Amino acid sequence: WRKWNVKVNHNEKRYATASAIAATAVASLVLARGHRVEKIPEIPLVVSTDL
Amino acid sequence: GAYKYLEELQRKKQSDVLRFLQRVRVWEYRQKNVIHRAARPTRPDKARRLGYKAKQGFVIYRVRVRRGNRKRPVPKGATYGKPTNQGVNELKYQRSLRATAEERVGRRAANLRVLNSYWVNQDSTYKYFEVILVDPQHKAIRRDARYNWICDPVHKHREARGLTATGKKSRGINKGHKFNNTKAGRRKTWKRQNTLSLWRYRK
Amino acid sequence: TVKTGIAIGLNKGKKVTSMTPAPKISYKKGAASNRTKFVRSLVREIAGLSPYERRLIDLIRNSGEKRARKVAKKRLGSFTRAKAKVEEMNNIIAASRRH
Amino acid sequence: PSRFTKTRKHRGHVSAGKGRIGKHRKHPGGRGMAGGQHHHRINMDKYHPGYFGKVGMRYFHKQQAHFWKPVLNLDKLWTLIPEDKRDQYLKSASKETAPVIDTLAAGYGKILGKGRIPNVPVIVKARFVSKLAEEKIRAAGGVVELIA
Amino acid sequence: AISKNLPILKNHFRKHWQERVKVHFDQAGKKVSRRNARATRAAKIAPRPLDLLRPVVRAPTVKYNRKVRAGRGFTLAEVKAAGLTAAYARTIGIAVDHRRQNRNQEIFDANVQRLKEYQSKIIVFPRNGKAPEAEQVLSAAATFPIAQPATDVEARAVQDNGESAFRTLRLARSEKKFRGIREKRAREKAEAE
RNA sequence: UUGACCUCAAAUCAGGUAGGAGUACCCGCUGAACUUAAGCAUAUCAAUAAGCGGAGGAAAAGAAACCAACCGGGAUUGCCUUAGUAACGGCGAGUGAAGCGGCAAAAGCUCAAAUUUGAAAUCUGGUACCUUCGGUGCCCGAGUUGUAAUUUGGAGAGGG
RNA sequence: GUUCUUUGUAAAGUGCCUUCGAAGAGUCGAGUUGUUUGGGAAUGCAGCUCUAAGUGGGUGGUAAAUUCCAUCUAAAGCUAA
RNA sequence: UUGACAUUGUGAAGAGACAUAGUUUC
Ligand SMILES: [Mg+2]
Ligand SMILES: [Mg+2]
Ligand SMILES: [Mg+2]
Ligand SMILES: [Mg+2]
Ligand SMILES: [Mg+2]
Ligand SMILES: [Mg+2]
Ligand SMILES: [Mg+2]
Ligand SMILES: [Mg+2]
Ligand SMILES: [Mg+2]
Ligand SMILES: [Mg+2]
Ligand SMILES: [Mg+2]
Ligand SMILES: [Mg+2]
Ligand SMILES: [Mg+2]
Ligand SMILES: [Mg+2]
Ligand SMILES: [Mg+2]
Ligand SMILES: [Mg+2]
Ligand SMILES: [Mg+2]
Ligand SMILES: [Mg+2]
Ligand SMILES: [Mg+2]
Ligand SMILES: [Mg+2]
Ligand SMILES: [Mg+2]
Ligand SMILES: [Mg+2]
Ligand SMILES: [Mg+2]
Ligand SMILES: [Mg+2]
Ligand SMILES: [Mg+2]
Ligand SMILES: [Mg+2]
Ligand SMILES: [Mg+2]
Ligand SMILES: [Mg+2]
Ligand SMILES: [Mg+2]
Ligand SMILES: [Mg+2]
Ligand SMILES: [Mg+2]
Ligand SMILES: [Mg+2]
Ligand SMILES: [Mg+2]
Ligand SMILES: [Mg+2]
Ligand SMILES: [Mg+2]
Ligand SMILES: [Mg+2]
Ligand SMILES: [Mg+2]
Ligand SMILES: [Mg+2]
Ligand SMILES: [Mg+2]
Ligand SMILES: [Mg+2]
Ligand SMILES: [Mg+2]
Ligand SMILES: [Mg+2]
Ligand SMILES: [Mg+2]
Ligand SMILES: [Mg+2]
Ligand SMILES: [Mg+2]
Ligand SMILES: [Mg+2]
Ligand SMILES: [Mg+2]
Ligand SMILES: [Mg+2]
Ligand SMILES: [Mg+2]
C-alpha cells in the first residue's frame, strides 16, 4: 500500500507537454539529445500526408 | 372458509375453550420424545399461511426446547478476565428458542429443508414448536414451480444460517434508521466501515 | 394546502399547480369488512371473555371508568389500547346486560 | 526520496541525532493525548484553550442540509450575469427592462450586503435578504422578489 | 505525546487496520472489464439500447429541489395518460414505478410528454421474428436528455409594491412562532363564560 | 365374525437423501486477554483472536411496516462524498454512523386469507408402450383436516 | 434463418356502470434483566412476565397527556447484475 | 438463601369489598 502512482495537475501536465513540443523545433536541443539531424533540411521537419 | 375462524379463535389463548385444549395438548407433547414426527399440523391454518401445503413432500416435526437464560458454561463461574465479563447468570443468547427448535429437527432430518416453524405451547420448562419441512428430492416438490426454489443448494440448512424468518429476525435484517448496524448484515457492514480504501491516485 | 411561496413561515414553500393522486388501497389495510366483522363477533360469543377482561368490567361496574383504564394500561401495552379496551367492555355491558 | 533524507547523513554517528543522554525511547510522554489534564496541561491551555468539558445543547440526528443556505454579497451579484450579457444591462439600466437574477438558481440562499452596486436597476430573486441587502438594492431602483 | 503548537489530530488506527487495506490496483482492470461487459450486453441485447426510459422528477429536500433529475420509473398515472398500460410499457424499454406519486402537474405533464416523444422515436419490431435489422442506438438517456425547466424571462419590468422583502420574512417567521400562543389566548378567552 | 379409520410400529421392504473434506471470500453462534488510558476498575484493544454450526461461485441483501418534511424521493448491493461530522465517552483516553447529491449496475415478483361445488378440475409411485432431462394408457396411492385454476394491495373479485 | 403440427368451441389486454374488497398473534406492543449500538428517559438482539386492534397497526432519533399531520402496510416467500 | 410472578387445576368451611344477595381475593 506504498504510494506508486502520482497525481500531477492536469493543467501543469499540459504546460510540460506544450513545452516539450516547442523544443522539438529548436534544433540545438534536438541535437543535444542524441539524434542525428545535421543532414535534415529544416526543423520542424514536415513530411507529406501520403505517409 | 374455516381457516379464517381458526385464525381468530387462536388469538383467544386465555379463553376458556383454549386453556382447556392447551392444558391437555401440552401434557401430551411432554410425554413424547423431545423431537417427534407430527402426523399433521395441530394448526392447519398457521402452517398453511406459512408455506405449508398438504401434498406429499411436506413434513411437520414437533420439538421442545428448554426455556430461560443461557447459563454461561465455565467451571465454577470463574471467568478469568475483567469484571465486565464476570457475568455467568443473567446472560441471554442472541437467537430464539424457536431457532434452536428449527436447528434440532433440521439436524434430525438432513434430507429435508427447513421451511418455517410456529409456536404451539409452553409450560415453565419448555416451549414447544411445530416445524414445517420440505423434501427437496420429492418429485412432487421438484416439479412445482413455486416450491422448487427450496431445491437449490443455496438453501442447504437455512436454519443454521439464520435465513428462516426467526433467523432473519435476530439477525436484524430490516430496513430503516433502527437497523443501521445490522441489515446488510452486521459483521459485513462493520468490515466495510473499517476498511481502508486507497486509490492509485490518492484521494 | 397551498404554499405561501416564500421560504419561511406558516405554509412555507413553492406554489405548484397541484394534483392529489388516485388513492392507494394499501392505505386501507386497517379497514373492517363484513366477513371479518361477522367472524370476530362469532368467535367472541363462542370463546367468551378472558380473565383480565372479566376483571375489567367489574372494575368498570364497581369502581368507575378511570381506574378501569389505569389497570388496563398496565395489562395491555399502553394508554391508547387501554382506552380502546375499556370502550369495548363498555359496549359489552350496554349491549348485553342492559338493552 | 531516501536519497535526500537526513538519516543517510546520520549514518556513522552513534546516536542518530537523538542524543546520548535522553535517548530515543518508546513513549516517554505516554501515548496519544495522554496526560492532557496533568503533565501535558501547559501545552493544552495555550495552544488549545477550550479543549475540556462542554458548552451548548446536543442535537440528536442533526441533518446538515436543513441548514443549507449559502451567502452572496451585493459585493458580487452582478457576477451571476454572464460577462457579455452584463455590460448590456449596466449601460441602459432601467425599469421596464431590468435583469432578473435567480440567485437560488445560482445556488445561493441569502443575499447579504457587503458593498456598493451601481445605480443600475436589478430584479433580485432570493430566499433571504439582509435588511441592508434589500435596502441597497432598492436604492438602485431594483427590488427583491422572494422565492422558494 | 503532546507538544508544540499543532492541531489535535484524529487518526483512528488502533484496530488491526492493516488487515483491511483495500488498494485499488485493479482500477484499470475493472474499467476494461466494465467496458467489455457493456460490449457484450449491447451485442446480446440485439438492437435494444443499454438503458430504460427514466422520468423527470423534482429532487427532494431544501438543498436540491432547485434541480430536477432522473427518476426511477414513470408512475401508473403517467403511463395511463401517455396511452399505454404498465405491463406493455415494461416490454418497450420504459421504466415504470408503482411507488411514485403525482402531486405536481408540471412534472406530471413533463413525463407524459417525455413518453409521447419516446414512443414516436422508437420502433417496435413485430413478434413474428422476421427481424428487419435496424441499428442500435445505445442510450435512451442520451437521446432524451433531462433539462432544467426555465423559470422566468431574462429581463422584465421592476414592480415594487412597497412592502419590503426582509420585513415580510420577519413577519412571516413571527406569525408562525406565536401561532400556538394566540390560539391559547383565543381558546381561553372563549371560556369567558 | 367381518371391513374401515386414527395414531403408533417392523422389515437386508421399492427408490432416494445427510455425514467428511476444503474454508481466501460468505451467513450465524460463542467469545478473550496482551494493549491504550503514561497507575486502574467503566472504557479501549474488539462487537477482534482462539472455539462451534452452515453455504456458494459468489454469499448475503432486495421490491419498503423505507427515506423524508421537499416542488418531495422510491427494491437491494457497491464506489466518491456526506465525515473524523450528528452522536457516544472515568465528556478522559478514545470512539463514531445515517438521510440528500454523483457514479457502477439495474428487474421484477410469489403465497396465506375466497364455494370448482353443474362435478379434485391437482399430484408421488408401479406398470405397459413411446419420438425418454420427457409423453400417453391403465392401476394402486396422496388429497376435502383442501391437492388445481382464479387473486396479492401497484391492487383485485362478483354482477351489468 | 428455415421446416412441421395449429395449441381453440382455449387463453390474455383494454373502456364504462354497480356491489364488494377476505390482507400473517404468545405476534405487534409493554415492563423488567442482560448484551450490544454513534442512538443520548434507552440502536438492535435475547430471556422471563404482561399481551392488542381493525377508520387498525408501525415509524416520525428528549420521557408524558391532549389534538392534529406526514409516511409506509410487520409478524409468510423468490429473485440476475 | 429469602420473596414475588409463571408452571397451577377441583371442592368445602373461614375471613376480605360495590357498602347483611355472590363475581373476586387471600
Ligand atoms: Mg403423509
Ligand atoms: Mg477470559
Ligand atoms: Mg459488561
Ligand atoms: Mg413443567
Ligand atoms: Mg455502528
Ligand atoms: Mg497525498
Ligand atoms: Mg517522507
Ligand atoms: Mg532516493
Ligand atoms: Mg546523499
Ligand atoms: Mg551530520
Ligand atoms: Mg557533520
Ligand atoms: Mg557519516
Ligand atoms: Mg555530532
Ligand atoms: Mg534530532
Ligand atoms: Mg545511545
Ligand atoms: Mg536525565
Ligand atoms: Mg474532548
Ligand atoms: Mg465577498
Ligand atoms: Mg481507519
Ligand atoms: Mg485485492
Ligand atoms: Mg447502464
Ligand atoms: Mg424469428
Ligand atoms: Mg431397500
Ligand atoms: Mg460439514
Ligand atoms: Mg467479545
Ligand atoms: Mg498488540
Ligand atoms: Mg494500542
Ligand atoms: Mg495501562
Ligand atoms: Mg506505561
Ligand atoms: Mg499494570
Ligand atoms: Mg464492547
Ligand atoms: Mg475466528
Ligand atoms: Mg462447490
Ligand atoms: Mg446462481
Ligand atoms: Mg459477479
Ligand atoms: Mg441469494
Ligand atoms: Mg433471500
Ligand atoms: Mg409490496
Ligand atoms: Mg433506494
Ligand atoms: Mg477526542
Ligand atoms: Mg466500538
Ligand atoms: Mg444516489
Ligand atoms: Mg424475476
Ligand atoms: Mg401482511
Ligand atoms: Mg455476546
Ligand atoms: Mg438496550
Ligand atoms: Mg407520544
Ligand atoms: Mg411519498
Ligand atoms: Mg412460497
Side-chain angles (χ1 to χ4, degrees), chain B residues 23-46:
Chain B
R23 199 124 96 93
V24 179
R25 295 180 172 161
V26 78
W27 160 89
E28 159 163 78
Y29 302 167
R30 187 174 42 238
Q31 307 306 302
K32 319 201 150 195
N33 283 343
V34 160
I35 281 191
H36 64 261
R37 217 282 182 73
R40 70 173 60 262
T42 66
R43 294 169 79 197
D45 80 310
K46 192 65 184 166

Side-chain angles (χ1 to χ4, degrees), chain C residues 25-45:
Chain C
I25 9 76
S26 49
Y27 269 71
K28 260 168 70 170
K29 192 171 218 195
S33 113
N34 311 349
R35 144 130 297 232
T36 53
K37 280 198 193 89
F38 178 88
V39 155
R40 276 159 182 175
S41 161
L42 206 275
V43 183
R44 229 293 140 60
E45 51 174 344

Side-chain angles (χ1 to χ4, degrees), chain B residues 179-197, chain E residues 15 19-22:
Chain B
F179 290 90
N180 284 345
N181 294 277
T182 133
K183 164 229 270 158
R186 144 217 151 197
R187 238 159 297 217
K188 161 174 136 172
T189 116
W190 171 90
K191 184 161 168 166
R192 187 203 310 123
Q193 310 184 349
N194 294 278
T195 267
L196 194 42
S197 172
Chain E
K15 304 190 218 186
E19 316 187 326
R20 289 178 300 272
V21 191
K22 170 99 78 287

Side-chain angles (χ1 to χ4, degrees), chain B residues 67-81:
Chain B
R67 281 149 124 312
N69 296 350
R70 178 168 114 101
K71 176 169 177 193
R72 161 177 275 142
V74 326
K76 317 201 221 215
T79 254
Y80 303 107

Side-chain angles (χ1 to χ4, degrees), chain A:
Chain A
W1 48 78
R2 173 201 294 278
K3 141 169 159 300
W4 308 92
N5 308 142
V6 183
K7 146 192 293 92
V8 176
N9 317 285
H10 195 160
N11 197 50
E12 180 194 307
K13 217 155 170 169
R14 278 149 175 180
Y15 195 120
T17 59
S19 240
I21 289 163
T24 59
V26 193
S28 349
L29 289 180
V30 196
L31 262 174
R33 221 229 115 213
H35 287 327
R36 305 285 197 276
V37 279
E38 322 199 324
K39 170 82 176 51
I40 72 108
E42 80 217 59
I43 256 177
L45 208 172
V46 182
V47 109
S48 162
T49 299
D50 284 324
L51 225 214

